[PDB]
Design a protein around this ligand. Structure first.
Ligand SMILES: NC(=O)C1=CN([C@@H]2O[C@H](COP(=O)(O)OP(=O)(O)OC[C@H]3O[C@@H](n4cnc5c(N)ncnc54)[C@H](O)[C@@H]3O)[C@@H](O)[C@H]2O)C=CC1
Ligand SMILES: NC(=O)C1=CN([C@@H]2O[C@H](COP(=O)(O)OP(=O)(O)OC[C@H]3O[C@@H](n4cnc5c(N)ncnc54)[C@H](O)[C@@H]3O)[C@@H](O)[C@H]2O)C=CC1
Ligand SMILES: NC(=O)C1=CN([C@@H]2O[C@H](COP(=O)(O)OP(=O)(O)OC[C@H]3O[C@@H](n4cnc5c(N)ncnc54)[C@H](O)[C@@H]3O)[C@@H](O)[C@H]2O)C=CC1
Ligand SMILES: NC(=O)C1=CN([C@@H]2O[C@H](COP(=O)(O)OP(=O)(O)OC[C@H]3O[C@@H](n4cnc5c(N)ncnc54)[C@H](O)[C@@H]3O)[C@@H](O)[C@H]2O)C=CC1
Ligand SMILES: O=C(O)CC[C@H](C(=O)O)[C@@H](O)C(=O)O
Ligand SMILES: O=C(O)CC[C@H](C(=O)O)[C@@H](O)C(=O)O
Ligand SMILES: O=C(O)CC[C@H](C(=O)O)[C@@H](O)C(=O)O
Ligand SMILES: O=C(O)CC[C@H](C(=O)O)[C@@H](O)C(=O)O
Ligand SMILES: [Mg+2]
Ligand SMILES: [Mg+2]
Ligand SMILES: [Mg+2]
Ligand SMILES: [Mg+2]
Lengths: 333, 333, 333, 333
């Protein structure tokens, strides 16, 4: 009996997480769902964006599936970003973000890469100050975190057909912070002689992803850089409607779509639940249910190929209609 | 005569700047070219990447055309990155990077945008420190610098028919630094009632550029963010072989390709000089020779459409063969 | 009636503030006393060391007299230093700390000086971070805060007999922070030709205060530096049982002893209320009741000279006895 | 023989170092002296305050005896403070600074204490930035540097009869940096069960040193704090004419007076050489010549007690005259 923590969050979180649940239910696997709260709406009702109860429930489960949470673009007393809080507190240091071609009109063919983003430090240390009309933020790179994110990315590349790892960085401008990251990952690469390791300055990396994403296997990079490159890559293979992720540490994992709360479409009945469902597939993989994971992915691909499709894929289908198509496709496998 | 400082830098700078010089010569304008040096090779021979003499030559000229300079990915005592030193020393606070559909196979149609990149602070303040195994860099945002770059971007938007500015930022995670930037630009936008000002989180902006770049007019953002978005954008419209830029302060400007020294192709006689040539067109415009600037851009589009083409555009033309085609087309206008 | 906010705080604040109230009551002046709460005991009772109510009460009065408050030597959730919060929030930028010989055995004669301590920034911005086993704190000096503290100290020096100002600093090891302080105070000094302005390195300053404190008139210095030198100075003239201060901003002021909550003697009935009483005298001066202030100070001197004395001055009097003697001396003037 | 490196520095270093040499010569020990230069004049001649040649000489001798060097109160391109450079580069992490009563007019009796100051980090890390009119310095405290200085002070306390260590700190205002210091020294104290370990807030500590310095045995503290407290303590026992020090690392040591170059009396041949001579005595102790140290100390005390005396001690003797008397007293012992 797998205990799964389900956390909806804000906006389209309320729409795509129940969809993912319905698909998980249709695997037949023994699953016990445990509901918990985080995000802006939780801050409004409980006074904190992440109640202690929610941490307890996550830790009491085998894995968690998170939708999304909205963040203000300014200081709000008592408010801190929910998922970012969870990432640092549970030490979910590896953010694993695959980008794969799928059979939809908006997708470049031939793409199969994974972005591995350091998920605890960098600018995301969030240590900012304002003095008169000058604001300063720490960007922090530690050897320790670089070793762990590097090792994580190397394992992933070693486990993949092409065994190629690109280190994306700005060491040329930031040789102490970005340089420590670069050199540390190259150092741990010595324990992975099967992996071919390359480095790429991050702006070039972004131009290469646009022009020839097929060249990449695994990309490892730092926190903010990974945030950016992973939305870019999603754009290459059909958009945020489809892009999954895992926030993975040593003892737990929180699986979530790369996308946010999407307030421009929350309440319209049309959000694409594919990203949340494929995040659930990654979750099944992490739990040791590789077969069920593949079946979920297969089901999604069948529907993506032959319809119905949500508006972000050029269709006119509701979230409900798309989810049901995926459930029936899965039942037939 | 207009005095134009020429600086080749490293790698393909030695190839594309002479090419650009030859195209300027064919405009028929009176130009006195003042050669100066900078970069990695300059540091090896002189002990500094930017001699004082070079600075004096730049200030003695109406404008400067700069190739590109190599930087290492590690601290090298006495070495500072050349273009970055110039940017800060000469206070070239606005980095203007147009991205525009061109008639070549690698190019999306319908793209016409300008990225206005704050060119002075953010992470490029270069105040890094290392303490045992933790490294820390300052990311600095000031009201003053944000006012100036916001005004520059608003002026450019006001001058363009679609009257739209997007502010790309990450203020949801960095509300003091990125938030100050966001708010200050919004404030100064009050003097520009004709401009439609929108804000967008930088990861989402990167996805939007990949999926629907036609929706953008002008984009303003901070230093590292604009570095990344502008190589992204170069990929949309044929690549770094074509992308021009201007580093523009209140009293001077240094025009240069977005691209670097490209050591993988340096010396092979095949680099695309279009980026340098179009940067010279931006320079001609800055100086008040708008007609000549249009004639240069037209010559370039003629050659891009009908060939010959360099290998980055799928042809087999040399840098000089391409340049000769542009000079010939220029003279026929 | 003058409204006077009374805040006891922790430890011996409970003992010396009621004593100072009694001496104020014996001046004959029209005084309405308004009680408010701050400190550690307030944090335990109310969940914050400075309730908003306390801030309002302070602002609704002509002046405030504060005892002292205990601070932990570690992070305690929800707790912040009370007096430091009030200094920053109410912008009480000048901490005026006089050191004057008194007729008691513990005291050097011929001493009459004022330490003017910047009360807002330096190390006291309290912006600390911990990354693995490395901890960093900001030490901030701004031109503006240095201008205000410089002017405050030059005005005070201008109005005293010797018209001499010493700027105590460590510009020698910290040229950007301490140097800015040093240079800025020297620059505002140009508007005060009446004052002889000298500078002195702070360690040397500490040695000179030990060996010839009689040489000093006014000393101006930064937050932490002035904290240290002011305790040193108190020790020269009878100790902390005698040393008064004012936290003075542009629109209000909080008077308080230099001393803290003295937990080693809280509840022993023997704490010297002279410091609190002299602070009340300073308060009277700020309010424009100079003759009342001189009477209070005279009554204090009479009792110090004749006895009875508290144990910190070698005597055996209770706080109560000492207080009654000052009340009696005051009424006989 | 012992190889002893001698560096004069600037100002009165040119007077007190030759004096100390003279007294060393008169001990009758095999000593080769090796001259070397550093400081501000040295910066003016050779372009650096510390030539590599000087570091090399230091590292080639058994110990170094340093004079004092001048430093400005503003940035000077190319200049770094000499002793501070040597402290960091040679990792001379413990600055041992004894304060003992001597038989002279300006001396409190019954003082015998040692200040052990962390000599490597804190505010001396030399990482300042200036952004518009705001300057910021790093104040850094590491667990490692704290363990190290802690253990040095604990060993010294264990070796003394009163077995008491005070930790002077400001962890009430800076709980992360100063707190880390406090807590770490307490941790390492568990290996020294014989030592009584107390903590004291540095301002209170300064007042206690003024009023009852006889209560202190060993005092450990951070870099800037120790600087101030050690000049304070020199005042107690006759002044900077007498106060000696050692900068002790694991593999080398630089002994030097607490005092600076003393530009107010440099050139007049009146500087008190006792501090330098007592620093040479500390150096003899360090080299294993414990008995010669005790003789040098006894010689100094005889001359301080019986005369002649320099002006700082209320006499009229020259540096040479005083020196010759010390040599004559040493020779008769
Ligand atoms: N893990 C989390 O808690 C995350 C939270 N956010 C937050 O979400 C809020 C809004 O962020 P945005 O910049 O507007 O980015 P977003 O990722 O929420 O949406 C960006 C664009 O993509 C479209 N989109 C996203 N998911 C879609 C879907 N499933 N189906 C169809 N269209 C989809 C949206 O309609 C929107 O136009 C912000 O507060 C942001 O911080 C963003 C990402 C992750
Ligand atoms: N303004 C400057 O001084 C700049 C300097 N750099 C420096 O340049 C060096 C190389 O950096 P990279 O990451 O390799 O970026 P890059 O811009 O030099 O090249 C990246 C890729 O684009 C290709 N490319 C660039 N320009 C081309 C052209 N004109 N024609 C055909 N192909 C072209 C190159 O062959 C390479 O594969 C580094 O040391 C970097 O720090 C990078 C950008 C600007
Ligand atoms: N304005 C404020 O809120 C202040 C608060 N504090 C806090 O006070 C607490 C205790 O600090 P300490 O380092 O022990 O310094 P302290 O100033 O409270 O006491 C230092 C020594 O001076 C003696 N002393 C102080 N005032 C005296 C008096 N009025 N009559 C007789 N003896 C007196 C004390 O008995 C003690 O031995 C700390 O948490 C500190 O943060 C300290 C100073 C000011
Ligand atoms: N180890 C080193 O290299 C040190 C260098 N300095 C530098 O030394 C320079 C002087 O700075 P100050 O603040 O004046 O400190 P200082 O230590 O040179 O002198 C302070 C006062 O003590 C007197 N004094 C010091 N040593 C004496 C002696 N041996 N005999 C008689 N009187 C003595 C001086 O005349 C002066 O009035 C500055 O440039 C400072 O940066 C200061 C201390 C140590
Ligand atoms: O809103 C937030 O606090 C986090 C947004 C979050 C991020 O990593 O920056 C989101 O953009 C993501 O990519 O997971
Ligand atoms: O190599 C360097 O020092 C500067 C790189 C430079 C940058 O702005 O980051 C380059 O990527 C550019 O776009 O100008
Ligand atoms: O306990 C605190 O938060 C501050 C104590 C306070 C200080 O200014 O450091 C105290 O020593 C003082 O001198 O007012
Ligand atoms: O002026 C300098 O560069 C060093 C001063 C030096 C210090 O340690 O702060 C001096 O005051 C000392 O006590 O060693
Ligand atoms: Mg993102
Ligand atoms: Mg770039
Ligand atoms: Mg104090
Ligand atoms: Mg000193």
């Amino acid at each position: 009996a797998y205990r799964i923590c389900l956390i909806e969050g804000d906006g389209i979180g309320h729409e795509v997480i129940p969809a993912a649940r319905r698909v998980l239910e249709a695997t037949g696997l023994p699953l016990e769902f445990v509901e918990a709260e985080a995000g802006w709406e939780t801050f409004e009702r409980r006074g904190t964006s992440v109640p202690e109860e929610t941490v307890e429930k996550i830790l009491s489960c085998h894995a968690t599936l998170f939708g999304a949470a909205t963040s203000p673009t300014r200081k709000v007393p008592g408010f801190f970003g929910a998922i970012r809080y969870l990432r640092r507190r549970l030490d979910l240091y590896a953010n694993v973000r695959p980008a794969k071609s799928r059979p939809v009109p908006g997708s470049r063919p031939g793409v199969d890469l994974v972005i591995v983003r350091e998920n605890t430090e960098g600018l995301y240390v969030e240590q900012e100050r304002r003095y008169l009309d000058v604001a300063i933020a720490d960007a922090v790179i530690s050897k320790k975190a670089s070793e762990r994110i590097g090792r994580a990315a190397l394992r992933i590349a070693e486990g993949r057909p092409r065994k190629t790892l690109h280190i994306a960085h700005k060491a040329n401008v930031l040789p102490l912070t970005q340089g420590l990251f670069l050199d540390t990952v190259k150092e741990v690469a010595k324990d992975f002689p099967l992996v071919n390791v390359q480095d790429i300055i991050v702006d070039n990396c972004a131009m290469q992803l646009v022009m020839r994403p097929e060249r990449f296997d695994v990309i490892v990079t730092t926190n903010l850089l990974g945030d950016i490159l992973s939305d870019l890559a999603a754009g290459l293979v059909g958009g945020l409607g489809l892009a999954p992720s895992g926030n993975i540490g040593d003892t737990t994992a929180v699986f979530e779509p790369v996308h946010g709360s999407a307030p421009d479409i929350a309440g319209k009945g049309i959000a694409n639940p594919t990203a949340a469902i494929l995040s659930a597939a990654m979750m099944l993989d992490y739990l040791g249910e590789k077969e069920a994971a593949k079946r979920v992915e297969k089901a999604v691909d069948l529907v993506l190929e032959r319809g119905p499709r949500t508006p972000d894929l050029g269709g006119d289908a509701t979230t409900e209609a798309f989810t049901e198509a995926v459930v029936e496709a899965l039942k037939s496998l």
